[PDB]
Design a protein around this ligand. Structure first.
Ligand code: 1N1
Length: 259
C-alpha cells in the first residue's frame, strides 16, 4: 500500500484520549511532521473492523475533513492523520475560549462544518454521528469534521426509530449542532432525558431560540428539524446561508453580552 510507513518513523509523544478499542496520541512522523496517531488495543476490536475507518478515509479528501496521512495495517495497528491543535469543538466551546466567542466566530465555525458536510453530501456519503464532540478545532478557528468510521438528542426521529440514516438526518444533527455553537457547549434539551426527548420531539416539540440567538438562526435550526427528511435543507444550502449570514440575513447585527 502507498500509505504504509515504518514503525520507526512514528513517535507517540503526548497521550490525548482513550477508549475501549485504543488511544489517540500527538506525535511526530518522519521526525518532522506533527501528526495525530490513533491505536487499537490488540484483542478488543477486530483489525478488519478498526481498519474500515481508514479504508474510508482513503477515498476522502477535503480541507474540512480530517486528513489521513499513513497507516500501519499489521498488528499492532496505527492510523495516522493531520493533528488538530485544540481538540474537540465541544471542549473548545465550553473551555477558556468559550467566553470570547460571539456570533461571527461561531457562524463561521458552523459554515466550515457545513462545507465539509456539503462535500460528504456530494459524495453521497452519510456521517451518522454529526455533533460538536466529533468536530476538531485547529489554529485560527479551523473546524474539521472528524470520525469517519446512543446520541438520541442529536439523531433524527426516522433514524432513531426506524434506522433510516441519511444526509437528511445528518442535517438534523447539524441543526442540533447549531444549539451547541450558540449555547457554548450545553447539552441539547436541558433537563430532558432520552425517553422524553423521543416522545416530545415525535409530538412536535423543538428547543426554543437560545438566549441572544437571532431568530433567523433559530429558523434555520427549525428547518433542519422538519419532520419530513425531504423538507430539510441541503448542506450546499446551509453552507451558502451561513457564509452570507451577516450580509444577506442579519446585516443589522450588534454584539451582545454573549452572542
Ligand atoms: C483528543 C484531542 N485531539 C487533538 N487533536 C487531534 N487531531 C486529530 C485527531 C484524531 O483523532 N484524528 C484521527 C485519527 C488519528 C484517526 C482516525 C480519525 C481521526 Cl479524526 S485528535 C488535540 C487534543 N488536545 C487536548 C486539549 N488541548 C488543550 C489546548 O488548550 C489541545 C490539544 N485532544
Amino acid at each position: 500500500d502507498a500509505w504504509e510507513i515504518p514503525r520507526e518513523s512514528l513517535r507517540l509523544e503526548v497521550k490525548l484520549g482513550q477508549g475501549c478499542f485504543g488511544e489517540v496520541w500527538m506525535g511526530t512522523w518522519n521526525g518532522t511532521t506533527r501528526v495525530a496517531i490513533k491505536t487499537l488495543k490488540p484483542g478488543t476490536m477486530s483489525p478488519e473492523a478498526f481498519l474500515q475507518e481508514a479504508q474510508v478515509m482513503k477515498k476522502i479528501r477535503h480541507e474540512k475533513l480530517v486528513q489521513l496521512y499513513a497507516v500501519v495495517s499489521e498488528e499492532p495497528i496505527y492510523i495516522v492523520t493531520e493533528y488538530m491543535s485544540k481538540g474537540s469543538l465541544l471542549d473548545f466551546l465550553k473551555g477558556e475560549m468559550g467566553k470570547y466567542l460571539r456570533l461571527p466566530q461561531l457562524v463561521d465555525m458552523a459554515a466550515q462544518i457545513a462545507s465539509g458536510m456539503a462535500y460528504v453530501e456530494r459524495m453521497n456519503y452519510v456521517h451518522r454521528d454529526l455533533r460538536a464532540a466529533n468536530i476538531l478545532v485547529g489554529e485560527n478557528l479551523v473546524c474539521k469534521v472528524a470520525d469517519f468510521g446512543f446520541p438520541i438528542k442529536w439523531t433524527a426521529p426516522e433514524a432513531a426509530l426506524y434506522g433510516r440514516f441519511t444526509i437528511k438526518s445528518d442535517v438534523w444533527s447539524f441543526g442540533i449542532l447549531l444549539t451547541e455553537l450558540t449555547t457554548k457547549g450545553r447539552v441539547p434539551y436541558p433537563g430532558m432525558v432520552n425517553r422524553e426527548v423521543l416522545d416530545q420531539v415525535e409530538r412536535g416539540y423543538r428547543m426554543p431560540c437560545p438566549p441572544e440567538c437571532p431568530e433567523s438562526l433559530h429558523d434555520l435550526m427549525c428547518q433542519c428539524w422538519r419532520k419530513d427528511p425531504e423538507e430539510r435543507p441541503t448542506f450546499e444550502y446551509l453552507q451558502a446561508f451561513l457564509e452570507d449570514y451577516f450580509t444577506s440575513t442579519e446585516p443589522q447585527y450588534q454584539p451582545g453580552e454573549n452572542l
